[PDB]
Amino acid sequence: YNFFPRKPKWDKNQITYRIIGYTPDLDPETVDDAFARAFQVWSDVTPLRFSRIHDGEADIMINFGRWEHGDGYPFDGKDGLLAHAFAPGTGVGGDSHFDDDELWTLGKGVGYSLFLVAAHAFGHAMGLEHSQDPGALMAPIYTYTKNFRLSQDDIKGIQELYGASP
């Protein structure tokens, strides 16, 4: 496992998120659930607790975008970047954006599981860099699987930043 330079992390365990926009690819309820389950991956093994809000600035602002979408880190059409997220911090820190020039599914088709990409993206949003462990959620490659389970590399990494729940 790895961290960003200087190991940035959230200075509190209660973290807010907000879904600012949606994709036409999936029902909004499916999108919401995908994100909820992606956060639960991490709250399973840390004292981090993620609360949704529908107004104001959440710690983790979630949105879909295409090409240049307001942060000066443009997406690139279909293929290439699927999504990105910023390391923990104020403002754009923690924010997680998904390239809607990709087809968002739950893993089937010429497309990508929103749950799996979100879980990976949220790893970055929590302060994890890419892992050299190929079986890790934080591996730099997307691999689809029907029954996802957080690897020991991911667990050890995230807990080195936040500890385990008592």
Partner: peptide
């Protein structure tokens, strides 16, 4: 497929 450099800093 690669994620590319999807890990950014604020």
């Amino acid at each position: 497929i690669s994620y590319g450099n999807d890990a950014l800093m604020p």
